[PDB]
Amino acid sequence: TSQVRQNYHQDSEAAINRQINLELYASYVYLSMSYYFDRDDVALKNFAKYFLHQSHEEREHAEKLMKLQNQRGGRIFLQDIQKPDEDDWESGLNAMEAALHLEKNVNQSLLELHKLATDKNDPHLADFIETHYLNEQVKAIKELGDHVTNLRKMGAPESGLAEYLFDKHTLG
Amino acid sequence: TSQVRQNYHQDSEAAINRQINLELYASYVYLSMSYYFDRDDVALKNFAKYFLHQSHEEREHAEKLMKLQNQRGGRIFLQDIQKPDEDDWESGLNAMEAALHLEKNVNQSLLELHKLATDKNDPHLADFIETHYLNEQVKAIKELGDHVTNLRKMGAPESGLAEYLFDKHTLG
Amino acid sequence: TSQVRQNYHQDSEAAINRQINLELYASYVYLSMSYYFDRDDVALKNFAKYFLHQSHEEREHAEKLMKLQNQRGGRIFLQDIQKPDEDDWESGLNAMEAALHLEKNVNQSLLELHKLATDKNDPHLADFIETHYLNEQVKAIKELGDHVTNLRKMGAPESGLAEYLFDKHTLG
Amino acid sequence: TSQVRQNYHQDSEAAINRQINLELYASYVYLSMSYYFDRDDVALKNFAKYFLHQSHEEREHAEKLMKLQNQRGGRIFLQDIQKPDEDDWESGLNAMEAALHLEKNVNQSLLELHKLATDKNDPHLADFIETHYLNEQVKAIKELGDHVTNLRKMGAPESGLAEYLFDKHTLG
Amino acid sequence: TSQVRQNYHQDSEAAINRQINLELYASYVYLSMSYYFDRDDVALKNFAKYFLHQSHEEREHAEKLMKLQNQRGGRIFLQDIQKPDEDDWESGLNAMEAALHLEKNVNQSLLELHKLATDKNDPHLADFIETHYLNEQVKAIKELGDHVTNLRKMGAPESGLAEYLFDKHTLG
Amino acid sequence: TSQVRQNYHQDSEAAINRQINLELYASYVYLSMSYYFDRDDVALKNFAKYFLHQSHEEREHAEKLMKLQNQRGGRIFLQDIQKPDEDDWESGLNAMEAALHLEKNVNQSLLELHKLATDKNDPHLADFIETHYLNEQVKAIKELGDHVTNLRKMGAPESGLAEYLFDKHTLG
Ligand SMILES: [Ca+2]
Ligand SMILES: [Ca+2]
Ligand SMILES: [Ca+2]
Ligand SMILES: [Ca+2]
Ligand SMILES: [Ca+2]
Ligand SMILES: [Ca+2]
Ligand SMILES: [Ca+2]
Ligand SMILES: [Ca+2]
Ligand SMILES: [Ca+2]
Ligand SMILES: [Ca+2]
Ligand SMILES: [Ca+2]
Ligand SMILES: [Ca+2]
Ligand SMILES: [Ca+2]
Ligand SMILES: [Ca+2]
Ligand SMILES: [Ca+2]
Ligand SMILES: [Ca+2]
Ligand SMILES: [Ca+2]
Ligand SMILES: [Ca+2]
Ligand SMILES: [Ca+2]
Ligand SMILES: [Ca+2]
Ligand SMILES: [Ca+2]
Ligand SMILES: [Ca+2]
Ligand SMILES: [Ca+2]
Ligand SMILES: [Ca+2]
Ligand SMILES: [Ca+2]
Ligand SMILES: [Ca+2]
Ligand SMILES: [Ca+2]
Ligand SMILES: [Ca+2]
Ligand SMILES: [Ca+2]
Ligand SMILES: [Ca+2]
Ligand SMILES: [Ca+2]
Ligand SMILES: [Ca+2]
Ligand SMILES: [Ca+2]
Ligand SMILES: [Ca+2]
Ligand SMILES: [Ca+2]
Ligand SMILES: [Ca+2]
Ligand SMILES: [Ca+2]
Ligand SMILES: [Ca+2]
Ligand SMILES: [Ca+2]
Ligand SMILES: [Ca+2]
Ligand SMILES: [Ca+2]
Ligand SMILES: [Ca+2]
Ligand SMILES: [Ca+2]
Ligand SMILES: [Ca+2]
Ligand SMILES: [Ca+2]
Ligand SMILES: [Ca+2]
Ligand SMILES: [Ca+2]
Ligand SMILES: [Ca+2]
Ligand SMILES: [Ca+2]
Ligand SMILES: [Ca+2]
Ligand SMILES: [Fe+3]
Ligand SMILES: [Fe+3]
Ligand SMILES: [Fe+3]
Ligand SMILES: [Fe+3]
Ligand SMILES: [Fe+3]
Ligand SMILES: [Fe+3]
Ligand SMILES: [Fe+3]
Ligand SMILES: [Fe+3]
Ligand SMILES: [Fe+3]
Ligand SMILES: [Fe+3]
Ligand SMILES: [Fe+3]
Ligand SMILES: [Fe+3]
C-alpha cells in the first residue's frame, strides 16, 4: 500500500480513474466542436474560441483529478479517450445543446462519485468534489442553458443571422 | 549576364515578370472593389476599407517580386495592368466571391511558379515562393471563404441589413 | 441620376476618370524607375527610394480623385494602366528628366481639367483641383528641375561619381 | 468540394487526420509520464513538470494541424486517442528513453507526410511540415538524447541520487 | 549509430563537414581582406570594418552547421583552413570582386548540398539550407554586386578618391 | 619600407606572423572541443559554452596581433590553420588537460617572442607582449590547472556524475 494512503477506498480510487477519463473525453468533445466552427463553411470564430476554451478547461479538470489520485495514494490507470459521437455538429445551437447534454452527464458522474465518497466515509474526497467540481458544473450547465435559450429565441439554427449575431455579441 | 546571376533559369525570370503583373492586377481589382463600396448608393465603408487594404497589400507583394527579380539578376519587364472585369461589383457578397475567385487564380499561378522552380532545381526561388507567398495565399483564401459563408448564411445580398451588419461587425 | 449629384457636368465626370488613369500611370512610371535603380548594375538605392516614394504618392493622388468622383455622384470607370515608355531608364539624370517631362504632362492635364470646371461653372471642382493638385504639381516640377540642374552641373551621366554623390547627399 | 480547396489531395487530407491523432497520442503519453513522476513513491517534480509541458505542447501541435486541415478545405475526422503502452514508466531514464522512441516515431510519420506532399506536388503542405514540424522534431529528439546520455553517465536508474540531481539541475 | 540519427545519409553528413570547412575558409578570406585595408599604405578603415564583420558572420555560419551536424547525429570532422589565395588584395574594388567570386562559390556548394538533401529525401536538411543559408547568400551576392558596380562607376581603383568616398559614404 | 616602420626587426615581424597563426590555431582547437561537448552522446552544454568562449577570445587575440603588425609597418602573411590533433576529446577532464597543454605551448611561444623583442631592443613590442598576452596566459593556465584538479578530485572521467556536476557548478 502507498505510504500516504489513508481512508481511501479501492472503489473511490477506481471511480476517480473513471472520472479522469470522462473529463478527458469532455475535453475531446469540445476540441471537436471548436474546429467544426473553424470550417470555412461554418465560420463562427467565437463559437470556435468558446469551445476551445472549454476544451482546455476540461483538460485542467482532468489534471487536477490525476493530482488528487496521487495525493491520496491511489494509482492512475488511463484508458482510451473515445472520439466524440459526431464529426459534424450541424449548427451553433445544436453544438450548445450537445454541450449541455455532455455537462449534465459529467455532473451525474460527479454526483455518483460524491455519493460513493460519503458512503465510504471519505470526507476529504467528498469535499474535494464539492469544492472543485460541483459548483463549476452547475455554473457550466446554467451558462449552456442560457446560450441555448438565446439561440432558440433569436431563431437559430435556421437563422444564420441569429447565429452570426450571437457569435459576435455573446461569445465575442 | 548579370554579375549576380546564378542558378536562375530564363523561364523562371519570365515567370517572375508574369507574376509581378498578376499581383499588380490583383491590386487594381481590389482598388476597384474598394471604391465601389464608397459609392453613395452602396455606402459600405468597411467593405471599402477592407478592399483598399487588400489593394495596398497586393502592391507590396508585387514590389517584393520586383526586388526578387533584381536580387537574382533577372530583368524586370513590366506590362500593362489590365482593368478589372467589372465596373459594378453588385453587392458585398458578390465582391467577396469575386475576390475568392481572384485569389484562387493567383494561387494557381504561384503553384505553377513553384513547380517551375523545382523543375529547374532552383531551391532559393522555390523557398521564396513558399515562405512569402503560398501560406499568405492559403490564409487569404480561407478568410474570403469564411466571409462568403457568413454573408450567405446571414441572407446577403437580398438582405441589405445582412451586408450592413457584416460591414459593422466583421469588417469594422 | 445619383441622389448626391449637383452641378456636376458629364464632361467633368469623364475628365476625372481620365485623370484617375493618368495618376495611376504616373504611379507605374515611378515604380518602374524605382526598381531600375535597384538593379545590381545600377545600384543607386536613394534614387530607388525617391522614385518609390513618388510612386506611392501618385497612388494617393489617384485614390483622392476616385473619392472625389464618388463625392460628386459620378461613376468611376477604370481603364488599363499602360506600361511605361521605357524599361531601362539609362541613368539618374535621364530618369529625372523623364520624371520632369511626366509631371509637366500631368500638370497640363490638370490645367485643362480646371479650365473645364470653370467653363462648366463648377467652383467646387475647380477649387478641388487648385487646392489639392495644382501647387503640388508646381512643387514637384520645381524639385525635379532642381535635381536635373544639379546632376547636369555635377557632370552626370558620364560621371558615375556625380550620380553616386547626388544619391548620397541630395536623395539620402 | 469546399470552396477553399485547391491543390489538396485526398491522400494528404487523410494523412493530416492521421497526424492529428498521432500528436494527440503523444500528448497523452506525456500526460501519463508527467503524473507518474508525481506519485509519492517516485516524487521527481521537475520530471513531472517537464513532461506536462511536453504534453501541452503536443496538444498545440495537434491544434495547428486541425487549423491546417480547415485552411486547406479538408475535413477533420477524429479517432480515439489510444492509452499509452505503459502505466508505470519505471524511472526517469526509462521515461526519457520512451519519449525519445516516441519522438522518433512522430518524426518518421512527419517525414512520410512530407514525402506524400511532395509526391502530390503540394508545396504549401510540404513547407508547412518543414517550417512548423520538422526542425521542432529534430530539436526534441536532440534534447531527449542529451537527457538520456546524461542520466546514463550519472548512473541512472540504479542511482536514485543521479535522477534526483538531474531533476534539480537539468530539469529544474 | 547515434541514438538521434534518423533519415540522415552518410553522404549528407560528409557534405556538411565539407560545408563547415568552406564557411571557415570564407571567414579566413574576409579576415585577410579586413587587415589588408588596415595597412598604413591602404588605410580604408570602413573597408576594414566591413570585411571584419563578414569574417565574424561567416564563423557564425560555420558554427550553425556544426550545431546541425550534432543535431542530426552526424560527427564533425574538421579539416585544415587553407590560407587565402592572395596576401595583397590590391584595392577596394579588387577585394569586393574577390568577395563576390567567393560568395558565388559558397552558393554553388550550398546549392549542391540542397540537391543532395533532396536526392536523399531529407526535407529537414533541405529546409535548413533554404531557411538559413540560401537567401542569405543571394542577399550577400546582391550587396557585393551593388558595391562592385558603384566602385566601377565612381572610377575605382585608379581613383583613390573614389575608394575614399565609397569607404565614407557606403561603408561608413 | 613602410613609412611607419621604426625599430621593428625583420625577425620580429616574422615571429608576429607565426604568433598570429598560433592564436588562430588555438581558436580552432577550442572550437573543436566546444562542439565535441555538444554531441548527443557527450552532452555537457557548459563545457561546450566554455570552450566556445575560449575560441572566440583566441580569435580576438589573433586580431590584435594582426593590428600590431600593421601598427608597426610589418606585413601580415597568413598560413593555413591546421586542424586539431584530435577529433574526439574523450571527456571533460581530457579536454581540460589538452587545453592546459595548448596554453602552455602558446605561452612558450609568447615568451620566446618577448625574448626576441628584447634581444632586438624593441621595448614597444616587449611591452605589448607583456601587457596584452603574458598575464592573460598565466591566468588561463592557472584556471585550467584549477579545473583539471577539481575534475580529478571529483573522480572524472570515470565518474560521469563528476563531469555533470562540474559542468553545472563550475562552468554553469
Ligand atoms: Ca486506505
Ligand atoms: Ca479498500
Ligand atoms: Ca483503479
Ligand atoms: Ca472507439
Ligand atoms: Ca459514432
Ligand atoms: Ca453517428
Ligand atoms: Ca447519425
Ligand atoms: Ca456561483
Ligand atoms: Ca544563371
Ligand atoms: Ca537559362
Ligand atoms: Ca523575361
Ligand atoms: Ca485592356
Ligand atoms: Ca470587360
Ligand atoms: Ca463584362
Ligand atoms: Ca457582364
Ligand atoms: Ca522551404
Ligand atoms: Ca497560418
Ligand atoms: Ca448635375
Ligand atoms: Ca451634364
Ligand atoms: Ca465618364
Ligand atoms: Ca499597352
Ligand atoms: Ca514602347
Ligand atoms: Ca521604345
Ligand atoms: Ca527606344
Ligand atoms: Ca480657390
Ligand atoms: Ca509652396
Ligand atoms: Ca483540390
Ligand atoms: Ca484528390
Ligand atoms: Ca480523411
Ligand atoms: Ca484501446
Ligand atoms: Ca498495453
Ligand atoms: Ca504492456
Ligand atoms: Ca510489459
Ligand atoms: Ca535549431
Ligand atoms: Ca539515418
Ligand atoms: Ca547512409
Ligand atoms: Ca563525414
Ligand atoms: Ca595549404
Ligand atoms: Ca597561393
Ligand atoms: Ca598567387
Ligand atoms: Ca599572383
Ligand atoms: Ca530578402
Ligand atoms: Ca625598422
Ligand atoms: Ca631588420
Ligand atoms: Ca614575415
Ligand atoms: Ca594539415
Ligand atoms: Ca592527426
Ligand atoms: Ca591522432
Ligand atoms: Ca590517436
Ligand atoms: Ca592577475
Ligand atoms: Fe466545462
Ligand atoms: Fe469538467
Ligand atoms: Fe490578398
Ligand atoms: Fe498577392
Ligand atoms: Fe509626383
Ligand atoms: Fe500626381
Ligand atoms: Fe515534443
Ligand atoms: Fe509533436
Ligand atoms: Fe557573407
Ligand atoms: Fe557563409
Ligand atoms: Fe585562452
Ligand atoms: Fe591566446
Mind sketching the topology for me?
The structure is cut from a larger assembly and holds six copies of chain A (172 residues).
Chain A: H1 10-36, H2 45-72, H3 92-119, H4 123-154, H5 160-169
Helix pairs in contact in A: 1-2, 1-3, 3-4
Bound molecules: calcium ion (CA) (50 copies) and fe (iii) ion (12 copies).
Residues 135, 139 of chain A line the site of one calcium ion (CA).
Tell how many strands the DSSP assignment of chain A holds.
Answer: 0
Number of H- or I-type helical stretches of chain A: 5
What general form of chain A does the structure show? elongated
The rounded distance between the terminal residues' Cα atoms of chain A is: 50 Å
**Largest interchain contact:** A-D, 32 and 32 residues
Q: Write down the Rg of chain A.
A: 18 Å
Write out the CATH superfamily name of chain A: Ferritin, core subunit, four-helix bundle
Under the CATH scheme, the architecture of chain A is Up-down Bundle
For this entry, what is the oligomeric state of its chains?
part of a larger assembly
Report the bound ligands by name, code or SMILES.
calcium ion, fe (iii) ion
The CATH class designation of chain A is: Mainly Alpha
Keywords (chains A, B, C, D, E, F): Acetylation, Cytoplasm, Cytoplasmic vesicle, Iron, Iron storage, Lysosome, Metal-binding, Neurodegeneration, Oxidoreductase, Phosphoprotein
Protein name (chains A, B, C, D, E, F): Ferritin heavy chain
Pfam family, one (chains A, B, C, D, E, F): Ferritin
Family (chains A, B, C, D, E, F): Belongs to the ferritin family.
